[PDB]
Structure formats: structure tokens, C-alpha cells
Amino acid sequence: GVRTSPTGEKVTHTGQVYDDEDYRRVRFVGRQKEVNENFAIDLIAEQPVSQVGSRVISCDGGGGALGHPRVYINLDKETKTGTCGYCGLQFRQQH
Amino acid sequence: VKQDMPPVGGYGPIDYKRNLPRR
Amino acid sequence: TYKYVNLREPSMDMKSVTDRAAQTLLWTELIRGLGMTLSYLFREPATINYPFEKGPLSPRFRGEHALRRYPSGEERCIACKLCEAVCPAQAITIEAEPRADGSRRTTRYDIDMTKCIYCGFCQEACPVDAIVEGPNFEFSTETHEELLYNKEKLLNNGDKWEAEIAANIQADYLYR
Amino acid sequence: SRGEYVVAKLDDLINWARRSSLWPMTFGLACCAVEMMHMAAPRYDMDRFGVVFRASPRQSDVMIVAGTLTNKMAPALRKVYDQMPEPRYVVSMGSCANGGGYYHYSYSVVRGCDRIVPVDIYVPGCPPTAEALLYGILQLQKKIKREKRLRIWYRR
Amino acid sequence: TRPTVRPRNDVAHKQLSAFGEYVAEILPKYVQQVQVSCFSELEICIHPDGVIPVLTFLRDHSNAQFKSLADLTAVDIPTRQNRFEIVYNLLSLRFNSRIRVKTYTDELTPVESSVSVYKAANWYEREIWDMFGVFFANHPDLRRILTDYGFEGHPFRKDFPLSGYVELRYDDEVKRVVAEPVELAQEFRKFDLNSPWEAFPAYRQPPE
Amino acid sequence: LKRGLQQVSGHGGLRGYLRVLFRANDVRVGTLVGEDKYGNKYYEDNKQFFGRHRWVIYTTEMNGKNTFWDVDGSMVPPEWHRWLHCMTDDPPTVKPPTARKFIWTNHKFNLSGTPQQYVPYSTTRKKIQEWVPPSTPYK
Amino acid sequence: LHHAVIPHGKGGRSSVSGIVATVFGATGFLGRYLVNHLGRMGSQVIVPYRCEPYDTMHLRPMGDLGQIIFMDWNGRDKDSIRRAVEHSNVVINLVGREWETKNFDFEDVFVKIPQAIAQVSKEAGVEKFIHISHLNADIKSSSKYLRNKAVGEKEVRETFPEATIIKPADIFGREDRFLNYFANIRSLGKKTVKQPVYIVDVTKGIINAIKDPDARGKTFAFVGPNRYLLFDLVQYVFAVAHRPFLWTTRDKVERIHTTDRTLPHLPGLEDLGVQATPLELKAIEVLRRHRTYRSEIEDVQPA
Amino acid sequence: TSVKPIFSRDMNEAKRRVRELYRAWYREVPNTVHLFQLDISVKQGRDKVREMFKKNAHVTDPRVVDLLVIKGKMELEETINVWKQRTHVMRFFHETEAPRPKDFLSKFYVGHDP
Amino acid sequence: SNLTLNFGPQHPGVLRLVMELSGEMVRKCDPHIGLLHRGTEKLIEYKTYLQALPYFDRLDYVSMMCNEQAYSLAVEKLLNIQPPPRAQWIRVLFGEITRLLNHIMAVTTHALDIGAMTPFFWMFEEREKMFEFYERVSGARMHAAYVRPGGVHQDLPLGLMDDIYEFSKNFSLRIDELEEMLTNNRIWRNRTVDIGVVTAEDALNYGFSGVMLRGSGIQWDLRKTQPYDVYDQVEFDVPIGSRGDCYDRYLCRVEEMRQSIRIISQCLNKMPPGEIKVDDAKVSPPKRAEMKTSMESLIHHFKLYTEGYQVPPGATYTAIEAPKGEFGVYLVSDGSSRPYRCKIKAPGFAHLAGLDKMSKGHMLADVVAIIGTQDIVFGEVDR
Ligand SMILES: NC(=O)C1=CN([C@@H]2O[C@H](COP(=O)(O)OP(=O)(O)OC[C@H]3O[C@@H](n4cnc5c(N)ncnc54)[C@H](OP(=O)(O)O)[C@@H]3O)[C@@H](O)[C@H]2O)C=CC1
Ligand code: SF4
Ligand code: SF4
Ligand code: SF4
Ligand SMILES: [Zn+2]
How is domain C64-175 classified at the CATH fold level? Predict the structure, then answer.
């Protein structure tokens, strides 16, 4: 689920793992580097690419006042799916 | 409709007098 | 409309002066105060047992804020810096980078719980409701190092519960 | 191992004896003092845990720093802290006390009460709930449970 | 204009206009600006040679009682020659009125020290001396209230920075609290929030 | 007066009534709402005043910490943390909401003064990328 | 050196100086003053302790937010010591109890402790290891203490050749051993030259030796500016303590009757460059606790 | 520029008031160093008092010298009273500076410092 | 000569007091205050309006909504906004609740500062229920900001006024039992009658405000003379003191608690269901549903929280009847998004100015009773 450097310490979702010439490896002695082991990139590549039969479609976020404000996105390119900046989940068109 | 909090037809009295039994 | 007090004269009627003398000699009202203290002695105590009965609260309680995330999705934050702009203690520290996907995101989202006055302005300033002041009071930290929450302590704290936070927001999203 | 058995149980006895009473003094400058007075309320007791308010510095086991620790106050703070016996334990209560807090970027405010006294238990909040302060005092008692003073004295 | 707009009254506005004109008629020597704002509170802007005559007139004279004294401050304004503005804020008892006597001064001028005609101005004057730096002559006691004794710099000025120059910490060398130059742990990010586009056209000063 | 026989004989008798007496303080058992994984039980009584509605009884061996004595807070899972602070009127056996597969199934409790606690660090990669000297020599 | 090891700006209190010091012992007297001067420098101090966390709690608020760090160690396992000096710029050896125990003696504390830590700090790959030893530590007799420290100096000179052996005299300070030991008494009258040196000059010498190279390898000696007699020292400290009066082991009394001598074959303070202070100022500082309420500066200065 | 004075008319009364205040600070030191239980001899205290008087030596305006006399008289009253503690009187000194040097070369080895 | 005692910051609030006393009956007392100095005015000068509202929430700390009400009415007076009526009535209800809270803490801490221990515990159980109300309303225990300039933010949830009604009945009985306990208690009357007399002429020259003016004669209520809100529609009366006693001032505080009970009763009975905040998106933030499904609401939310609303240039001084007295705020605002200089008139500061005339001819236990008998919190006295 997570990568780990050959120094033995876990990387994060941001690649900030320390080198061989630091002292923060010594500040982590005896106390665990509480890293979130749940990356945010790979939980979207597992999502189904939705296919909506219109041309320009809405995005709420699953609930009135529970979610991002409405974005209306366009689906006119043929090789690149439209992508909500808030959501991150894609759409396509069907005709 | 509206779902505020008004009282229900007006509440009862609340005493505001110094009460002593002088027994 | 004024209602002024401390206006009585000592009545030279025999009953009033002998009642004041009986008050002075026979210790009437001090035993009356003893009677009031005995009346609260024979009550039931209005205490709660702490480690078994945690006290009552409200569904909008403010404390131990953490980051939410989407239903079956990624992080909810945008690094739009509204919370850093509104934070009156100036405790928020945001550094933003986009990842390889192209969505704008972060690198660093650090909050000092020491500086945090716990207003609620970062709860209410967030447009997508990413940071929410949580339910509880569980800090009690031995070191000054550990009260400085990184993004990943915030995400573990937002993944230790969402059901609580989602229940409180679903209880109270029609007021704010 | 009979001597180590005796010394371990005696250490547990004296650590229970220390954590049993723990009657503090109340320093308490600003509104965190009012919240200490609200954990002196009947709904959150102190005499269930041996804790009795006592402003005598010479017989107070632990001390609760609470309120904005200013530069005019802090010499008087450590002047109180010195005349205090050989077990001394400090609870920093409130955002003003545990790292400066809301008055952090100002003159005449010490940036947290780590600059004057050592601090054992931080309890953040503004004000930290009397319920939360009571939780912090229980974790202070468990720090008293984990002292191992007499075991280290034996195996010195 | 009826909902959510504060309704102003014109009776108090006309009365405070008439009374400010009356005050400036009967005291011609010390009066420069007589202004009434939109929400009807009087302001009289004053040369610093008449603090005792204006306040002895205003505490008495039986047509304006003004027994009570409130805030005194001397708001620290740069860009001028005379920087400080001392604001005596007088409240009456028989009349329900509020006037602000605003006299001006620079950094090195004694104003006439109103402690003899308002006993409430004792700690107000001592506090303004300690915080701003305006000396008050013929005054019983000037000490430092609301500051440390070893601290100086008159900190409420705009010239004194937000964080001070000294910072205390305990050390075990000399076994006491010592003062060191400030080494902050975070920047105090100053934000550039003053956006353009002139949110009030009614307050446009005339250009050069 | 007569409850005290049936308060002992209903709680379990000589055995359990003394154990929960020496546990912390109180003996008000008798409502039996529901137990929970990590063993602990939740009892909501209705007759007592507001503050003594709902109590919890913790069990031993939840993370191998010998929690018979020195019981903390923070050992309760968050649905019962909503229920127990009086924010609702229904137990979480009715509707446990918003399952959300990323949610912890372990609930690692309050962990200060352990080998496993939080340390702060900069979640930020390389700043300015210092120069690298060439490997080859000259002459 | 990597970045975040370069210095930045002024000194102390989140002003990053460029050293990471692993400081052995450090719970007693001299280590606490040295951690005080390193927290004033604004460094990272790794203190290992084997005792209760209450004493490192008393020396805790010295450094800034997370500058100093605490870790456990022992005198038996090399793994905890290598974990202590995993990554460290410098390491200093300040250890030794003035009386025996049932678990550790004067034997093999000064032989088994510095060999193990010098071995694992050479193998971990650090530089500028500074070891303190007592003055006049010789193979010649009359102290188990001093012959063990002489064997320790020879062993730390043998292994890890680029070490800084530094040796102070009988240092005196606010919480001294020997001067407080003199004030807490009741005594004899003999003659013995002895030169105390004040502790803040010694630790300024140590921090200058720890951040000022060209002093690596060479052994240094601290000489106080006084060098006078013990009898007039005792009468001066009683006269400043306002009392006339005309663990106490045999090794301690033979240390305070050992004639401290100096050899100029190794350089002192001036080739390192910090001013020394005389007795009397700091003596009037430390000699409090006279009586209920209770100057005559003697200044013998023999030879 | 007919300016209102504070106390004086020219520099003559300024010199008279500052020598009066220096006489007071000279006779005020040994009482305080006996009282607050300091660690510094009387001669060093008097030398730093006259150093504090030699610090402001280039001041020429009479109102400014009058205001400095007022500052010194306020602090002398607060030190002849027992209001100020040991901390502030030791804060007048400088024992915990580790003072930064003034040569260009040692300002160059710890740089970015004009 | 005479005994110059130095009462330090130990508890008999927190101060330092140097008293050159004669012989168990004093001569010259000087309060050295300023030990709790924080720098509120400089911090508000370097911050915005909405961000520096909690400084006005906590410069006084026992009163927690009247100080918010004073600063919010300063900004609403300068900015020309009348708040909606339901916001005004909730503001009045919480002003009366905070008034009840501050008077009952002043009574109990004066009783404990003399030395009586138990009504402290009783009325702090009552104030625990007060804080339960504050928790249910805002979410904070004590420091609820909650009062925006532009009306009450985020109105009270459904199911509160019945609890306030129950609390009104039970609290009337509990204050009647406090008068049953104390008040004709003989040793307490012996403790405080003839100490700290104040002439009304000196009450006006020394600038006393609020309860001191009620005790020393002259009838002066801001709520009756200058109605700054809907106080003109609720009917109540103010208590006046005949003699200048401390016992008289105690009676005045108890009767102000009782009149706060009356105003809470009428405010519950006459609540209009108008609206939460103002009808202007440029001052109050828009609600979250319109924010999400509206463009202009998102733009006004974003700019109103980053830059804040601007304020027209000008200076104002408003003051409201806080339980300590005329709590005053004097704003000076250059036309910008930050205030230029704010300053606070503290009734505790004005009362502590007259400590010499209140403790000239009495002993030192009476000095402690005088320091207690004025609701002085030593955080508001600092400014
Ligand atoms: N007269 C003097 O003071 C002089 C002293 N020195 C040297 O200074 C050093 C420190 O002396 P000082 O502070 O006065 O006395 P201490 O004995 O108190 O200091 C030694 C430190 O090392 C620790 N220590 C000692 N033995 C052991 C052990 N076996 N295992 C683990 N830790 C140990 C001590 O206790 P703990 O285990 O609790 O940490 C303490 O922290 C010594 O090495 C001494 O040779 C040199 C010249 C003069
Ligand atoms: S306001 Fe919300 S979306 Fe914006 S930076 Fe803060 S947490 Fe992220
Ligand atoms: S609640 Fe805390 S983090 Fe949020 S805006 Fe306030 S001080 Fe900042
Ligand atoms: S932390 Fe908050 S509650 Fe405590 S003193 Fe500071 S402002 Fe008051
Ligand atoms: Zn979307």
C-alpha cells in the first residue's frame, strides 16, 4: 500500500523521506513515524469512469450542503475525459 | 413552512418576588 | 422606574423590639441557617462519576479538529488558504503543490494546537467542509512536540472517526 | 529476586500513596482559573480523587499553571515554584499557557510556560473543559504510576 | 431603505449642532473644529493651552453638567507634526449627552494634566504616560502602570514593533530569569489585505 | 432498604458486586442496554437525573495493557462516543452510519507515553537542491 | 555535511547552530551546565539517561521546542549506544560516580564504559569526540579513582586516535561537590597546593573546543589563576560562610589531600582563548546559607 | 519655534539636574546591593551607572535631557523602593549575552549581518 | 515608621498591593496592577475586525456576551446596520443570561473571599447549567464568540426555550434560598456594613460606573436612559441604594439578578420569528446552501473572509451596561479592512481607581472585603 526507502523508513504520499546524512532519523528513535498508510492517488484510479449521456454535466458531490459547490464540466474531447477539480472523478459522454 | 423556535402560545408565569416565611 | 431598598426604622412597638432582642439573644437566624444547611445535607448529590459517565455535550462542540475526506474518495481539502487567511491565532501553515494527476493539493498543512484558541472560523470558512472541529477532548499530551499536528496526524484523526463527524454534520447542516 | 520483589511492591505502595492525594495549589490568572473553579463545582468533583484546593505553596504537591503568563508575572511564578517540595509536577492548562496561544506575537507575554518552569502535562483547550482537565489529571496520576524511582534506586 | 439600515434621528443632530455652536461661541479662545458626525456625538477639536479651562467650564456652568470622565487616549498618528491626540470623553448625568474633547500634542509637550478637575484621570494619565510617552506637568505621581519595570520603549506607538526587543527565559547559569533578543519560532506573516477599488466615494480627499 | 439485597443478588452476588465496587465507584447496574466488541458494556438507566443516564463498564485485555485497574477515557469506539455524551436518543445498534472502507477497524486508543506516539516532522520535499560536484578529476 | 547542518543567523532559542551533540551522563552537575550552554548556543542535544525521567525533567526546559531529545541507555549493551550515536556531529564523554555501588565499581566504569562508546562512535563514523578526565590521573598510587582514570586516558588515546582528551582541575560551582563538602562539616591543618577553576570558564572552554577545530587530537588542561594553599582556602571559605569552626569516603579525602600539580607541556586556556575568573566573586556567589541572618578577602596566592 | 519647556531654559539647568541625579544614583547603589543580595561589587555597579550616564552623552536638546532626568528619577524611585526584584536589577547588567564581536572578519564567518 | 506590607500575587484575584499601613489600621495603599498585561490593543491594531472579535470576547472573561455585544454594537453603529429583530431579542436574552452569570459569580466569589464556602458550590452548580446552555447554543463552554457585527450568527437550535423556562423557575427558587441562607446572617452583617462609604460627588469625580452609582444614591441606568436595543419594549426597574454600604451594594446585585429573571421571562414570552442575520451579503456571510448553489454568494464569502468587510472612516465611542458598569469601546477606523486604534473603558479600572477613598479609614480585612465587593477580574482592568 505504501512505498518504503532502502533506509528502512516509510515514505509518505509526498516523497519526503530522509537521507543518510540527517538527524531526524535520530529524532524518530523509539517513537513511530505516524504516516497515513492510505494514499489519495490510488483511491481514484480504482473508481469507475462514469458515462453520462449528455454533453455538459453537473457535479455536486453527493448531497445538498454536503459536498463541493456545483461545477458544470464539458465532455467534448474524445481522448481526454473531463475531470472535476474538486471531486477528482472523471466523466464521459454517450451518444 | 418554517421551523424556528417560538414559544407555544406563551409560557407560564415565573416568580420574581423575595419569598420568606418569617416563622 | 426605581425600586430602592434598605428603608426601615426600628419600630418602638414592643413586639418588634422584643423580636429583635430575641433574635440578638436566643440565636434564631443562625439556627435557621443551620436548618438550611441541613436541608441541603439530606439531598442527593448532583455529581457524576467521571471515568464511567462522561458528561453531556452538544452536537456542535468545538475541539480536536481533523480533515474529512470524500465518500469513497480522496482528501477533501484544496489548499485554497481560506482557513489560513481567517485563522485569528495565525496557527495554520499551508504549503501547496499539485500532484501528478493535475488536481491542486498540498504538501504541508500544519496546525499548532498550542496556538489554537478553538474559534470555529476554520470550521465555517472552509467551502468544501474539509476541516471540522471534532467531538472530543482527548489531548492530555506529555510533550510540547506532540501538540503540533501535521497533515498526517490530521488525516489519521479524520480517519479514526468520520461516522461521528458525519453524524454531527448531518445533524447540523441546516443551521450553518 | 526476593529483594527486588520487596522493593518493587514498596515502590508501588509509595507511588500509590503519592498519586492518591495530590492536593495542588491554584495559580490561575485568567479565565482558565474560572474553569478550575468550575472543576471545583459539584458536577465535577475534586474530593473524589483526594484533590483539595490549598493556596499554600509549601505543602502543595502539584501546581497548575493557568492563564496568560506575562513577563511581569513569570519571576513571581518561579519564585512560587522554588519554595515547593522535592516531588513537584506541573500541569500547563490552556492555550495561553502551553505555547503562547492567542497572545503569542506580543511583548510582555512569555511564549508558553516552558520558558520558566518544566511542564509535565499539557492540557490544551480554550478553556479546556473541566471534564478534559480532569482527564489530564488522571493521566498525571498514571505518570505517577510509571515513576520506577525506587527500582532505579535499587539497580543503581 | 427601511429594512436592515440603521434609522438616524435629526432632533439630536440639530440639538448637538446648536450646542456645539453655542460652546464655540462662549469659548472663542481655544476652539478650532466643531464637528457632529452622522450618528450624533459631538467632537470639539482643541489647542493644548486650554485643557483646564475647557474642562473646568464643562464640569460646571449649569447648562452642561458633564460630571463623568471616560476614555482619554491620544491615538498615535504619524504623518503629522503634532502626533498624539488626547481624547477626553465626557458624559453628562442630567442630560444624556456625549462630547469628545480632542486636543492635540506632539511628543515633547506637557499638556495641563486634568488630574485636579477629574480624579478619575489619575490612572488614565499615568497609563497614557507609560504607554504613549506624553509627559504631564504639575502632576503628583508618574510611574509605570501596565508595563514591566525593566521594560521600556513606550510600546503602544506605531514605531515600536509587534514583538518586543526583549524576551524572558529562565536559565540555570545565573539561576534566574534573563532577557534576550527575540528569536521567534514563526514569522508572524503580515497579510496584504488592503485591496483597491475605492469602497467609499464620499470620503475622497481632493488630489494635488 | 430492600433494593440492596436485590441489587447484589441481581448484579451477580458476592462476585461481581465487589469487583465493580473496587473498580471505580458505583453500583447502579440493572438496565442492560448492550455489550460491544473490545468487550465493554453500555448501560442506559432512565430513572436517575440528567448526567447519570448512560454509563460504561470497561473490560480487561483490549490491547494487552492490563486495563483492569487504571482505566482511561478514550477506549470507547466513536459511535458510542456519540451515544454516551448525550448527543442522541438511539443506540448505535439501530443505525451504524457511513461505513467507508478506509475507516480504522482497530481504534488505536490514547497513546501518550508509549513507544507508539506522534512525532512532528516537515511533510515537504527538497527545498533548493544543492550542487553536485563532478566525479572525474583533472590531470 | 548535509543541509540543516549549516548555521543560520544569531545564537540560541530556535537559532540553528551547526552541531548535534550526544552528551553522555549529563544528569549530574557538569553535564547540566554543558547542556545549558548548548541550549544557549541553539543546537540539538541528545542526552541519554538511565535514571528516572524526573531528573531529565528538571534539566528539560533548557533547550528550545524539541531541540534536546531524551533516550535510554545502559552500561551493558552496545546496541543502545549505537542507537544513541546513529547520526551525531559530536559526542562527549562525561561519566563517573564518586563512590562505588553493588552493580558498578570504580573498576571498569572508566575502562568498560569509554572503550565501548569510543568503539561504537568510531564504527558509527563521527568526529570530534571529547572525553573529560580528572587532572593528575597517573599510574602512580593512592587512588583507585585516579589510577582507573589514567587507564581510561591511555585506552581512549589508544583506540579512536583523533580524540580530544581534556582535563579540568577540581572545578567549583553553584552546586559543587568539594566546596559544598567543605562547607558541610563538623577537619585538619596541613599544607597542599590546590587550584579550583570556575565551571562556566571550563564549559566555555569545552564549547570553544567543540566548535573550534585545530584543537583535535591535542589534550588540554584547565588551570585556574589562583594556585594556592588548602589551609587558607578552608579558613577563607569559613570566613565568607560566617562560621568560625576553628558520602564521606576515604577516596574523596585522599583526592582533597592529593597535591594537584600542573605541567605546561600541554596548553591551557590562552591557546584556546577564553578568560578565567578568580575565586572570590563566584565564592561569594555560591556561599549562601550562612545562618539566620549572620568581606575580608583572604587571597593567600602562594608561590 | 517658541517651544514650551519641560523644566529648564537651556542646558545649564539640564547639567544641574543630571549631576543631582548622578549624585543620587551614586549614593543609591550600595544600599541596593546589600538589600537585593546581588553578586557584584560596589565599584562595578558604580562603573556601570556612570557608563549609563556616558551612553547618552551626545544629547543636546534641553527638553530631551529633562525627559531623561525624569526617566532616571522614576527608576531611582522604583529602585529605592523594594518594588523591583533581583531579576530587573540583574537585567540592567549583561552576564548572559555571549556577546557578538564587532570585527568585520568574525561578522563574516557568521554572515548576513551588516 | 509604618509597616509597608507587600501583598503579592497569592490568593487572599491576582494583583500586587503595597500598603504603608499604620498599626492594623492602614495609612496609604497602592495597587500595583498590570501583572496580567497581554497587548490586546496592539494585536487588534495588527488584525482585522472579524478576526480580532475574540480579543473583545476575552479581555473581560467572566462576562462573555456583553463584551461581544459592546464591540458588535460599536461596529454596527459605525457601519450603519440595524440588526433584524430576532437577532436583537436573542442578543437581549443572552445579555440577561450573562448578566445573571456575572452577578452570581461576583456574589459567590465575594462570599468565598470573606471565607464562607457553601453557596459557592450551590450557585456554581447553577452556573454549570448556564454553561450547558452556552454549549448547546454555540459549542463552546465559556468563550462563545457567536455575536457577529451584523446580528446573531447561526441561531439557536430547536428545543431550548423550554429548558430556559425550567431554569427560570428553579433559579428563582435557588436565589430565594440564597437570601434564606445569607442576608440577615448576623456575622456577615457584622463583617460588612459601615465599610467603604462613597459620596455621590466623589462617585462622579472618581468616575465610578454601574453598581457603585446605584449604591451611592444617584439613579443612573444606561438601559433606562439610552436604549441601545429593544430594552425599551421590556418593562423592568432598577434597584437603588439608600446608604453607601457594602451590604447595600450586595442587595443591589441580588435585585439586579431578580430583574434579569423578569427580563428573561418577558423575552421568552415575546420572541418574534424574524430571521437570524441581516439582509445584506456584504457584511454577514451568506448561508452555505446559497454559497454552494450561487456565484455571488461564493464571491462574497471568499472576499468577506479574506479581506473582510471594509468600514467607513470615522471614530465612535459606544458603551453598554455590562454587569460591572459602563463597558465602553472607542473605535477609530481609517477607511480600510482593519481598525486603526481601539480602546476599552473598563468599569473595574474606574472602580479600582478609587481604592484610596474606599480604604482610607478601615482595616485590612476590610480592604480585602472592598477588593471583593467590586466585581473586579484583573484581566479587564488591564487594557
Ligand atoms: N570534582 C568534580 O566535580 C570534577 C569532576 N570531573 C568529572 O566530571 C564528571 C561528572 O561529575 P559530577 O557531575 O560532579 O558527578 P556525577 O556522578 O553526578 O556525574 C556523572 C554522571 O554520569 C552518571 N553516571 C555515573 N556513573 C554511571 C553509571 N555507572 N551508569 C550510568 N550513569 C552513570 C551520573 O548519574 P546518572 O546515572 O543518574 O545519570 C551523572 O549523570 C565525572 O566524569 C568526573 O570525573 C572532573 C573534574 C572535577
Ligand atoms: S479552507 Fe478548507 S479547502 Fe481551503 S485550505 Fe483550508 S481546509 Fe483546505
Ligand atoms: S479554531 Fe484554531 S485553527 Fe481554526 S481558525 Fe481558530 S485558532 Fe485557527
Ligand atoms: S487559554 Fe483561553 S481560557 Fe485559558 S486563559 Fe487563555 S484565553 Fe482564557
Ligand atoms: Zn465535482
Answer: Alpha-Beta Plaits (3.30.70)
